Enzyme design. Structure first.
Site, mmCIF file in Angstrom:
data_model
loop_
_atom_site.group_PDB
_atom_site.id
_atom_site.type_symbol
_atom_site.label_atom_id
_atom_site.label_comp_id
_atom_site.label_asym_id
_atom_site.label_seq_id
_atom_site.Cartn_x
_atom_site.Cartn_y
_atom_site.Cartn_z
ATOM 1 N N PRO A 172 -3.383 8.755 8.609
ATOM 2 C CA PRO A 172 -4.403 8.745 9.662
ATOM 3 C C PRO A 172 -4.582 7.366 10.278
ATOM 4 O O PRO A 172 -4.371 6.336 9.634
ATOM 5 C CB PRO A 172 -5.676 9.186 8.930
ATOM 6 C CG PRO A 172 -5.191 9.880 7.704
ATOM 7 C CD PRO A 172 -3.947 9.151 7.310
ATOM 8 N N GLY A 173 -4.984 7.362 11.546
ATOM 9 C CA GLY A 173 -5.284 6.126 12.236
ATOM 10 C C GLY A 173 -4.090 5.358 12.747
ATOM 11 O O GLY A 173 -4.209 4.156 12.998
ATOM 12 N N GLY B 216 -2.204 6.481 15.518
ATOM 13 C CA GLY B 216 -2.134 6.668 16.946
ATOM 14 C C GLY B 216 -1.417 7.911 17.439
ATOM 15 O O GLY B 216 -0.950 7.912 18.581
ATOM 16 N N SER C 79 8.694 5.689 -11.885
ATOM 17 C CA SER C 79 9.159 4.409 -11.363
ATOM 18 C C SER C 79 9.018 3.272 -12.364
ATOM 19 O O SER C 79 9.595 2.201 -12.149
ATOM 20 C CB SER C 79 8.396 4.062 -10.087
ATOM 21 O OG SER C 79 8.888 4.803 -8.986
ATOM 22 N N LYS D 101 6.289 -1.397 -2.355
ATOM 23 C CA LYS D 101 6.531 -2.213 -3.539
ATOM 24 C C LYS D 101 7.009 -3.608 -3.160
ATOM 25 O O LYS D 101 6.565 -4.604 -3.741
ATOM 26 C CB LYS D 101 7.541 -1.524 -4.453
ATOM 27 C CG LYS D 101 6.985 -0.314 -5.176
ATOM 28 C CD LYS D 101 8.087 0.494 -5.833
ATOM 29 C CE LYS D 101 7.517 1.702 -6.550
ATOM 30 N NZ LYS D 101 8.569 2.699 -6.872
HETATM 31 N N1 LIG Z 1 -0.036 0.998 17.602
HETATM 32 C C1 LIG Z 1 -1.267 1.028 18.120
HETATM 33 N N2 LIG Z 1 -1.550 0.211 19.157
HETATM 34 C C2 LIG Z 1 -2.779 0.236 19.679
HETATM 35 N N3 LIG Z 1 -3.826 0.981 19.319
HETATM 36 C C3 LIG Z 1 -3.518 1.779 18.293
HETATM 37 C C4 LIG Z 1 -2.295 1.866 17.648
HETATM 38 N N4 LIG Z 1 -2.344 2.802 16.627
HETATM 39 C C5 LIG Z 1 -3.574 3.252 16.678
HETATM 40 N N5 LIG Z 1 -4.339 2.678 17.660
HETATM 41 C C6 LIG Z 1 -5.734 2.967 17.966
HETATM 42 O O1 LIG Z 1 -6.378 3.360 16.766
HETATM 43 C C7 LIG Z 1 -7.116 4.583 16.973
HETATM 44 C C8 LIG Z 1 -6.406 5.718 16.285
HETATM 45 O O2 LIG Z 1 -6.859 6.955 16.872
HETATM 46 P P1 LIG Z 1 -5.922 8.223 16.934
HETATM 47 O O3 LIG Z 1 -6.715 9.456 17.101
HETATM 48 O O4 LIG Z 1 -4.862 7.978 18.002
HETATM 49 O O5 LIG Z 1 -5.192 8.200 15.533
HETATM 50 P P2 LIG Z 1 -4.388 9.233 14.629
HETATM 51 O O6 LIG Z 1 -3.702 8.582 13.500
HETATM 52 O O7 LIG Z 1 -3.495 10.040 15.564
HETATM 53 O O8 LIG Z 1 -5.540 10.201 14.144
HETATM 54 P P3 LIG Z 1 -5.729 11.674 13.562
HETATM 55 O O9 LIG Z 1 -4.377 12.011 12.932
HETATM 56 O O10 LIG Z 1 -6.773 11.521 12.451
HETATM 57 O O11 LIG Z 1 -6.137 12.614 14.645
HETATM 58 C C9 LIG Z 1 -7.235 4.723 18.485
HETATM 59 O O12 LIG Z 1 -8.364 4.008 18.973
HETATM 60 C C10 LIG Z 1 -5.926 4.105 18.971
HETATM 61 O O13 LIG Z 1 -6.049 3.584 20.289
#
Ligand SMILES: Nc1ncnc2c1ncn2[C@@H]1O[C@H](COP(=O)(O)OP(=O)(O)OP(=O)(O)O)[C@@H](O)[C@H]1O
Ligand SMILES: Nc1ncnc2c1ncn2[C@@H]1O[C@H](COP(=O)(O)OP(=O)(O)OP(=O)(O)O)[C@@H](O)[C@H]1O
Ligand SMILES: Nc1ncnc2c1ncn2[C@@H]1O[C@H](COP(=O)(O)OP(=O)(O)OP(=O)(O)O)[C@@H](O)[C@H]1O
Ligand SMILES: [Mg+2]
Ligand SMILES: [Mg+2]
Ligand SMILES: [Mg+2]
Lengths: 527, 186, 95, 252
Positions: free
Chosen positions: A111-112, A114, A435, A478
Site C-alpha cells: 500500500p501507498g 501509487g 532463511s 536483507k
Molecule cells: N512514486 C510516487 N511519486 C509521487 N507521489 C507518489 C508516489 N507513490 C505514491 N505517491 C503518493 O502517495 C499517495 C499514495 O496514494 P495511492 O492511492 O496512489 O496509493 P496506493 O498504493 O495505490 O493505494 P491503495 O492500494 O491503498 O489504494 C498519493 O498521494 C500519491 O500521490
C-alpha cells in the site's frame, strides 16, 4: 413519432453494427404500434434510449506522441519505471498499428506506492476518458451485469454506464481493489469479471439489460490489488500482472523533496521561505520515522511538520520556522527507529543473521548457550516464537552441525553430549522461514569451538541435511538491512547471484559479497 | 498460431523482429512451464511490444532476439535448476513429484543424528504431510526387515539414530508416492 | 472437410476432435440432425471456449455463447409469465 | 406537475455541478412522460427527491478565531493537550489557506477518556454540523454503499443520510469503534483522499465530494484496524489520567 426522428438523429452520427441496428429497428416498430401511455411503451422507450445513447463506433482522440506522454507521466509520479515502460510500449504498439487498442493490466504491490493515482496519470497521458470502478467490498453482481427489462427499475450496469458517461468506446477503466471483491450470497462478482476481462470474449460482452453484445475489446482495464494470491486463478490468468515495488530511502528522499513537500506547501499555503525543510532533515526523518515501503506515512509526517510550522507562524510566535535535525523531534515527536544492531561485538555463541520485515529489512542474532554444566546424549531447546518451518530448520541445522563437527574435529564431542539452548532475541516478535539455517549452523559451530565469528559478517540461506546451501527470497531487504547495520561482508546462496546483481548500484556499493554452494565455504569465510 | 496473431496485433513484420524456434523453446522451458497457454501468449506479446518500442523510438531498425539477450525482454528466469544433486552421495535418492507447474523432482536425504552406528529411531522433517510421514514409518519398518533378511550381521538400521529430510523445507508435500525412494535411501 | 476445418484453428486437442468426428459419423449413419450434450473441463487456457466456434464451423451450425458464470437469475433460463409488463422468453428461446 | 417545480426550487440556492445537473434534468424530462400511478414514476420520484435534497455546495460558516476556539475547548475538557493542539493546527491551516478543509483523525485510547465528548466539543468549537456513525458490529456494506435503485427498497447509504441531515458538505462525522468492525473495504473508498473527493454511492449513481468532511474515528486498540484502513488515518493517542488529573477533572 417525433421521438423516432430524435433516435435517428442520435444514431446517424454513430457507426452502429448490424445487429444493433436490427434490434433498434424492431423496437422502433414495436414502440410505433404501442400507445403513448402503456407501461410497455415506457419500457420500450427507455430501452431504446439506452441503446441509442451508447457510443457505438466512436473513440477518443488518443495521443500517440512518446515525448509528451513521457513528460505527462513524469509530472506526477517518480520511479514507477515498469508502469511507465509498459505505457510507452503500449503507445508504440498503438502507433505501429493503425487503430487504438485495449489491454488488461493489473498493478499490484504494497500500500501507498501509487497504484491508484498512476491510473489517472496514465489516462491523462493517453488523452483517454477515465472512470474509477471500485469493486472493493462489492458483492452485487447486478452492478456488473444488471437486470432484464422485465424488472421495474432495471439498469444496464457499471460498464455500460461508463460507456454512456464517457461518450467514448475506448475509455480507461480502473477496477480498484479487485482482490477485495466480495464472495457474497448475491452471486459471485468475480465470475462475471472473468467474462468482463476475457481478452478474446471482450468483443462480445453481453449485458442483461441490453441483451446485445458490446465491443469492449478496445477498453483499457487497469486493476489494483495489494495481494495477488487471493485473486481466483481463472481471473488471475487473464490479467497481465506487473509489480509495483516499494521505494528505498534514496528514492523516498527524492519523492518527498520533489512531490510531497511542494504539494503539502500548496495545501497548507505556506511559502518556501516561511518554513524550509532541508534535505538533511528529510533524510533523517525518513531514516528514523518512515522505514515502511509506502509513501503514505512520510506524507503524514511532512504534513505534520508543515501544519505545526503554520500554526507557529499564524499565532505570532515567530515570523519564520527553522526546522533543523536537532529540533525535528519537537515537531515529529519521539524517534521510532534508533538502534539498528543489537551486538557491537559478538560473543562466541552468537551469529548475526538477516531477516525480511514489512518496514524494510531487519537483522536477527541467533543466540546459543550451554544449559547444563557438563559438556544419554545432547539435546537442543529452541525459543523465540519460531514457527514450524523455523523449528524444522533448527533441527536440520543441529543434525548437520553434529555431522560437520564430527567430521572436522573428531575429538570435539561438544555437540554430541552437551545440552544446548538456542534463542533468537525480540522474543515477542514471531518469526518464520528457512532463511536462518546457515546462521544456526554457524552459531552452533562457533559455540562448540568457542570461537567468535568475524565481527562484521552477516549470512543467510537455507541449509539441507547434507550441507548444501539453497536459495532464499527477500534479497533486497536483507541487503538493505545489512548495509544499514554497518555490515561489511555478506554471505548469500550462489543461486541468488542474479537476484543480488539485479539490485540498484547504490544499494550494493560498500558490501563485500561471497556466494556459496556448500556450507564449507561459509565455514571458511566465517572463521 | 500465437506468434502470427501477436505479430498481426502489434503490426510488426517478420523482418523487423525475428523470433526463432530455439529462443521460443528456451522461453517456454524457462518461463512458461504451466499447462495453460495464456502466459506464453503474454510473454510473446511482451517481447514483440518491446521490439516495437525499440523500433519506434529510433533505437534500432531491426531487433534480433538472441537466446542470450532474452532476459532484456522478459527478465529473470523463473526455473533454472532442474536437479539439486549432479552426483548423489550415499545417503540420497532421487524421486519424482507432481506439481502444477509441470513435473518436479525431489531428493530424499538421510544422515546420522548420533555418532554410534537401546533402539534406533527416525526423525522426519521437511514439512511432510501425515500420509507421507506414515509412508516413511512403513518404509523404515520394511527397510529394517529387508536388511535383516539380506544381511543378518548389519545392525545399522536397528540401532542407529537416523534423520530423514526432503529439501525445500518451506514447500509442503504429501502423498505416499515416495515410499520406495525412502526405502532405497535408508 | 470437418477435420481440415478443425485442424486449421486449433492444435493438438485430439480427444475433442475425435469426439466431434464420431458425432459426425453417427449423424451420417442415420439421416437426422443429431443433438448431444458435452462438457469440457480442464486447466485454464487450454482452449475450451475457443474450440466451440471451430466445432460450430466444422458442423456448419449456428453458434451462440451463453455464459452463466456468476448468474443468479433463473428468469434467464426460463423467462417470465407473459402476464407481466416486460416478459421475455429467456436466453434459449431468444437464441 | 407541481412536483417538478418543487424539485426545481430546491436547486435555486444550491450550486449543482455539471455532471449532477445533467442527471437531474434528464430525470426531470423523463418524469413528465410517466403516469402518476406507475411504479417507474414512484422510483423516479424517490430518485429526484434524493438528488435534490443533497446540499450541493452548502458549507457551514466555520469560525477561524484561535482564541475563541481555544476558549471553547478548555471550557469542555481538561488536559487533552494532543487533541487540542491538533485542532488548533487544523484551524491555523484553514485560516492560512483561506478555505475549509477535511482531515481524517483517529483518537484511540482506553475507554472513558472522553473521545466522543471531545469530538462533540470540537464540532461545537468549529461551528460544524455533528453526526454519529456507529460502525461497531456493522457487517453489511449496504450501510455505506447502499443498494441499486432497481430493488423495491433502496438506501443511499449512511453517508448520504448524513449529508441530507446536516445540510452541509463539511460536517464532522464521528466513526466510533473502527476496531470492532465485522465490510471494511467500503470504508477505504470513503476515507481515501485520492478517491474521497469522488465518493460514489450505488443508489445515487453520482459521485459526491466529501473532501471537506472532517472524519473523526475513535478506537480502543490500534492493532485490530486493518493495515490498509490504518494507513489512511492519522493515529492520535489519548492517554490515561493520573490520580492528580482525575482529581482535577472531578473538581472542575
Ligand atoms: N512514486 C510516487 N511519486 C509521487 N507521489 C507518489 C508516489 N507513490 C505514491 N505517491 C503518493 O502517495 C499517495 C499514495 O496514494 P495511492 O492511492 O496512489 O496509493 P496506493 O498504493 O495505490 O493505494 P491503495 O492500494 O491503498 O489504494 C498519493 O498521494 C500519491 O500521490
Ligand atoms: N490448441 C490451441 N491452439 C491454438 N491456440 C490455442 C489452443 N488452445 C488455446 N489457444 C488459444 O489460447 C487462448 C485461450 O482462450 P480460451 O477462451 O480458449 O480459454 P479456455 O481454455 O477456455 O480458458 P478459461 O477456462 O479461462 O475460460 C485463446 O487465444 C486460444 O485461441
Ligand atoms: N478531560 C475531561 N474533562 C472532563 N470530562 C471528561 C474528560 N475526559 C472524560 N470526561 C468525561 O468522561 C466521560 C467519558 O464519556 P465518553 O463517551 O466521551 O468516553 P470515551 O472514552 O470516548 O468512550 P468510548 O470508548 O466508550 O466511546 C464523559 O462524561 C466525559 O464528559
Ligand atoms: Mg486505491
Ligand atoms: Mg472460457
Ligand atoms: Mg465512542
Amino acid at each position: 413519432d417525433a421521438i423516432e426522428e430524435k433516435f435517428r438523429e442520435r444514431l446517424k452520427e454513430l457507426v452502429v453494427p448490424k445487429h444493433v441496428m436490427d434490434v433498434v429497428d424492431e423496437e422502433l416498430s414495436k414502440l410505433g404500434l404501442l400507445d403513448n401511455h402503456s407501461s410497455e411503451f415506457n419500457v420500450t422507450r427507455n430501452y431504446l434510449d439506452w441503446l441509442t445513447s451508447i457510443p457505438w463506433g466512436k473513440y477518443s482522440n488518443e495521443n500517440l506522441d512518446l515525448a509528451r506522454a513521457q513528460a505527462v507521466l513524469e509530472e506526477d509520479h517518480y520511479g514507477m519505471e515498469d508502469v511507465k515502460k509498459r505505457i510507452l510500449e503500449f503507445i508504440a504498439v498503438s502507433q505501429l498499428r493503425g487503430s487504438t487498442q485495449g489491454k488488461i493490466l493489473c498493478f499490484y504491490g504494497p500500500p501507498g506506492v501509487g497504484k491508484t493515482s498512476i491510473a489517472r496519470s496514465i489516462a491523462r497521458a493517453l488523452n483517454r476518458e477515465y472512470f474509477r470502478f471500485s469493486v472493493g467490498g462489492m458483492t452485487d453482481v447486478a452492478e456488473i451485469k444488471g437486470h432484464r427489462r422485465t424488472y421495474v427499475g432495471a439498469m444496464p450496469g457499471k460498464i455500460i454506464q461508463c460507456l454512456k458517461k464517457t461518450k467514448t468506446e475506448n475509455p480507461l477503466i480502473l477496477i480498484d481493489e479487485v482482490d477485495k471483491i466480495g464472495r457474497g450470497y448475491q452471486g459471485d462478482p468475480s465470475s462475471a469479471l472473468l467474462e468482463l476481462l476475457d481478452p478474446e470474449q471482450n468483443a462480445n460482452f453481453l449485458d442483461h439489460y441490453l441483451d446485445v453484445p458490446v465491443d469492449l475489446s478496445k477498453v483499457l482495464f487497469i486493476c489494483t490489488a495489494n495481494v495477488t494470491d487471493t485473486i481466483p486463478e481463472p481471473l488471475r490468468d487473464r490479467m497481465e500482472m506487473i509489480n509495483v515495488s516499494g521505494y528505498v530511502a534514496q528514492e523516498k528522499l527524492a519523492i518527498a523533496e520533489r512531490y510531497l513537500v511542494p504539494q503539502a506547501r500548496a495545501l497548507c499555503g505556506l511559502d518556501e521561505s516561511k518554513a524550509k525543510l532541508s534535505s538533511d532533515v528529510l533524510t533523517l526523518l525518513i531514516k528514523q520515522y518512515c522505514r515502511e515501503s509506502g509513501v503514505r506515512n512520510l506524507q503524514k509526517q511532512v504534513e505534520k511538520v508543515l501544519r505545526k510550522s503554520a500554526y507557529k507562524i499564524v499565532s505570532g510566535e515567530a515570523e519564520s520556522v527553522e526546522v533543523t535535525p536537532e529540533n525535528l523531534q519537537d515537531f515529529v515527536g519521539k524517534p521510532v527507529f534508533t538502534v539498528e544492531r543489537m551486538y557491537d561485538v559478538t560473543p562466541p555463541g552468537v551469529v548475526m543473521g538477516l531477516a525480511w520485515t514489512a518496514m524494510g529489512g531487519s537483522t536477527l542474532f541467533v543466540e546459543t548457550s550451554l544449559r547444563r554444566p557438563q559438556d544419554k546424549d545432547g539435546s537442543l531447546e529452541v525459543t523465540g516464537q519460531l514457527g514450524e518451518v523455523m523449528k524444522e530448520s533448527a533441527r536440520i541445522a543441529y543434525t548437520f552441525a553434529r555431522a560437520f563437527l564430527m567430521q572436522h574435529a573428531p575429538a570435539n564431542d561438544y555437540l554430541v553430549t552437551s545440552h544446548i539452548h538456542l534463542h533468537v532475541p525480540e522474543g515477542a516478535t514471531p518469526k518464520d522461514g528457512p532463511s536462518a539455517g546457515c546462521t544456526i549452523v554457524t552459531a552452533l559451530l562457533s559455540l562448540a569451538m568457542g570461537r567468535p565469528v568475524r565481527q562484521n559478517l552477516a549470512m543467510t540461506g537455507e541449509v539441507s541435511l547434507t550441507g548444501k546451501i539453497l536459495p532464499v527470497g527477500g534479497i533486497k531487504e536483507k541487503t538493505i538491512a545489512a548495509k544499514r547495520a554497518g555490515v561489511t561482508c555478506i554471505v548469500l546462496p550462489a543461486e541468488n547471484k542474479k537476484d543480488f546483481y539485479d539490485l540498484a548500484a547504490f544499494i550494493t556499493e560498500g558490501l563485500e559479497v561471497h556466494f556459496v554452494e556448500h556450507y564449507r565455504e561459509i565455514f571458511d569465510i566465517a572463521f
